Amino acid sequence: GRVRTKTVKKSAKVIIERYYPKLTLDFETNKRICDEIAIIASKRLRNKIAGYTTHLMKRIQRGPVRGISFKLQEEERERKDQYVPEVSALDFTGQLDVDTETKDLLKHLGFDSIPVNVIPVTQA
RNA sequence: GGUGAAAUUCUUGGAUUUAUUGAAGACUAACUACUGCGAAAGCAUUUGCCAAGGAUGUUUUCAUUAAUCAGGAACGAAAGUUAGGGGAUCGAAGACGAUCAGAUACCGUCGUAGUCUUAACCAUAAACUAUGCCGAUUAGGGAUCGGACGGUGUUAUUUUUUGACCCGUUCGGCACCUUACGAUAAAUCAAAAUGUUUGGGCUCCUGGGGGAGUAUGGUCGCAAGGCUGAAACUUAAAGAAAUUGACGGAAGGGCACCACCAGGGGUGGAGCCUGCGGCUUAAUUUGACUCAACACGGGGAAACUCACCAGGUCCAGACACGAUGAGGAUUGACAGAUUGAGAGCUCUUUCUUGAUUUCGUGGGUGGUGGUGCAUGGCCGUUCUUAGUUGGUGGAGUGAUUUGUCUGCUUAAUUGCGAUAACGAACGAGACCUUAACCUGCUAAAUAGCCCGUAUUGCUUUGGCAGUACGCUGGCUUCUUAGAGGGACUAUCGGCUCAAGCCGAUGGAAGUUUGAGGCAAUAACAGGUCUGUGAUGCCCUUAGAUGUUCUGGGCCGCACGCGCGCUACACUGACACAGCCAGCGAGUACUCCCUUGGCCGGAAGGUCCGGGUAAUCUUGUUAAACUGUGUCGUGCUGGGGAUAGAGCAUUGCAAUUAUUGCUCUUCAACGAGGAAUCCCUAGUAAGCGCAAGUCAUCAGCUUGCGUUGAUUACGUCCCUGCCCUUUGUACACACC
Ligand SMILES: [Mg+2]
Ligand SMILES: [Mg+2]
Ligand SMILES: [Mg+2]
Ligand SMILES: [Mg+2]
Ligand SMILES: [Mg+2]
Ligand SMILES: [Mg+2]
Ligand SMILES: [Mg+2]
Ligand SMILES: [Mg+2]
Ligand SMILES: [Mg+2]
Ligand SMILES: [Mg+2]
Ligand SMILES: [Mg+2]
Ligand SMILES: [Mg+2]
Ligand SMILES: [Mg+2]
Ligand SMILES: [Mg+2]
Ligand SMILES: [Mg+2]
Ligand SMILES: [Mg+2]
Ligand SMILES: [Mg+2]
Ligand SMILES: [Mg+2]
Ligand SMILES: [Mg+2]
Ligand SMILES: [Mg+2]
Ligand SMILES: [Mg+2]
Ligand SMILES: [Mg+2]
Ligand SMILES: [Mg+2]
Ligand SMILES: [Mg+2]
Ligand SMILES: [Mg+2]
């Protein structure tokens, strides 16, 4: 079968992890890319590397792949992480719906001032 | 009926099967559980009676009455014994039927004791939790059984109790799950912990393996036997738990035409070569004996090769010492006769050299002599499959293990991934050679094409391999050969997270594009001492196991085997005609490849010449094959074995025919038993050619081309291989 070896996969990932904007989905252009940037001196190996590189580039157009950054993702996950809604989900805006034992803890701890709504506790 | 398949057996007297009923004896299915009771052995239908028991609860009683126990006693599965009853089923022994070499067994049909019960014995089980009884302490957790307690809500009853279910606490049980502050040699253990920091109480047993739970004595038993229980003698291990391999008629997964399936072509059925043993001895030189010996030693031996007799040769015994020795000492070669002899070896004479030499003592050289079980090197094989190894980290006291893997994927330890491993090195792949593409580049009189010149034959009206190196201006499609490009699964449709897989399109090429080369760790007592001045040791070294010469032998022939050639014909044989390749080789002290002319029936002979090679042999005009005829279903014009005669060639030599040609002779063989080999596309098969060997001989091998298929594209059934789990009493490793 035609299963590519690690020397092809690992090298191609380094190409994508570094030269993503220069690469594209065209094999013929990707063929010329490997000429300038890599030192293969083996037409079969270079064709395999360009062929496997093109395969992942078409995969990138869908959201995959894990573990091959591709720094354009890195800058993207930065802005995903920084995102935050202005209204906290912990806001009480019926304010705090807890049970009999929880409110008892508030009395014990000396904080019997929270707008606590005591709910019943039963077993079905 | 019964079985892997059968048979013994029953059956038209109705077997087996169907329904109803009856009798007999045994047993108590499903419910049935990591549940219960009992001191253990054991105990599973209902009901009644009889006696007993643990746990629970207790603000009841006694007050040390307790624990363990040598002898002693009760109970004690199954089998077995005695005397009755019963006797359905099953079933020791026994009889048959199969299987098998045997089958006193496993398998099947019968079948006695027994299996069941009352009375009386027996007292042993892998009677096991292989783990004595009492007591205290020590990590967590959830189930479950019995009792008790507290709470909650449904459900059935109820003058609000009780049962079922739910949650929790506690006592007492059967167990279980994770962990190691601990234990052990380890497997593993909440006990096998609280033990070299060694003492809570009591009883029993053991002291390397056998002999041996045997002999004897005692005692119990109706008996079978039980309990108690040695010694002589023998032996360096036996044994326990784990580890890595190997093996398995163990399981899971995956592969291979040196495996099979579907097929194709063979071999095994005479004769050829000795390719392999007896016989002759000078010998039929010798090595190799499953794959991994037997057209192998590139081993197609006339002489040589040669290693298997005779005859000679060796200061082809270097060098050192001594003697013959300075009256010359030493020493060899000729001629005739004998002696094969062409060594004067013998009868004689000539030269002769002077310690170049001849003997003796040491020491060397040579040996296709032995040892491949002393070795190097090389090759083959394990093993053509995908496997192997450190470093740091983790587990284990240790051998060692993880890394190197559950799953999917791949031809692949190939990847995607999971992950006490991370990061790497080999092998695979990658790489190199070769085949297929380029009307793109480079450039060719040692390759071609077009153009033109001269000329030939028909037409003469334009067409012919037409023919002709300095006959030629241009070009490189064909040919040659360098750089390059080209395929990377490209695109599309599906499955899938991925790795990838299937189909179609385009493309010269889509199985890794086809075929090879190289090819890891470890090993074999694999082969080679007969390749080597590559060698250790042993043997021999003047009547040689050195060397050379003649002849013979390696070929000898009742017999068995292996690799092959030709055939058993009509899809054919023969005669003419048509008529197309590729890989290659070729001349110096002597002829290598050979053209053309001449002679001959053929093999051949002769003469002038070409080629040290894209130039000449050579377009190697190969064969198979196609066309037209003869033959005719006859072992026949198939087949060419054996043999007779003659003629040439190579060689110094052809006899046991080297080989070639002509005529004649015309054997088995009509498709091949039990068995067995190779093979998936330009492949099998058929057909030939060149090279190696070579003065001559190719039925052999290495390559090349021509014609060119049937059938899978799957599997683990046979034979083997790879990985994992598992078992092992194996490690010389299932021979
Ligand atoms: Mg009947
Ligand atoms: Mg019960
Ligand atoms: Mg029952
Ligand atoms: Mg009671
Ligand atoms: Mg006992
Ligand atoms: Mg015991
Ligand atoms: Mg205790
Ligand atoms: Mg309990
Ligand atoms: Mg309870
Ligand atoms: Mg219990
Ligand atoms: Mg002892
Ligand atoms: Mg003992
Ligand atoms: Mg053991
Ligand atoms: Mg196959
Ligand atoms: Mg075979
Ligand atoms: Mg077959
Ligand atoms: Mg021979
Ligand atoms: Mg083999
Ligand atoms: Mg010969
Ligand atoms: Mg000879
Ligand atoms: Mg050897
Ligand atoms: Mg060797
Ligand atoms: Mg390590
Ligand atoms: Mg370590
Ligand atoms: Mg350690």
Ligand SMILES: [Mg+2]
């Ligand atoms: Mg290849």
Ligand SMILES: [Mg+2]
């Ligand atoms: Mg050798």
Ligand SMILES: [Mg+2]
């Ligand atoms: Mg000799």
Ligand SMILES: [Mg+2]
């Ligand atoms: Mg001789």
Ligand SMILES: [Mg+2]
């Ligand atoms: Mg052979």
Ligand SMILES: [Mg+2]
């Ligand atoms: Mg044949």
Ligand SMILES: [Mg+2]
């Ligand atoms: Mg003919």
Ligand SMILES: [Mg+2]
């Ligand atoms: Mg030609």
Ligand SMILES: [Mg+2]
């Ligand atoms: Mg020849």
Ligand SMILES: [Mg+2]
């Ligand atoms: Mg040969």
Ligand SMILES: [Mg+2]
């Ligand atoms: Mg076992």
Ligand SMILES: [Mg+2]
């Ligand atoms: Mg052993």
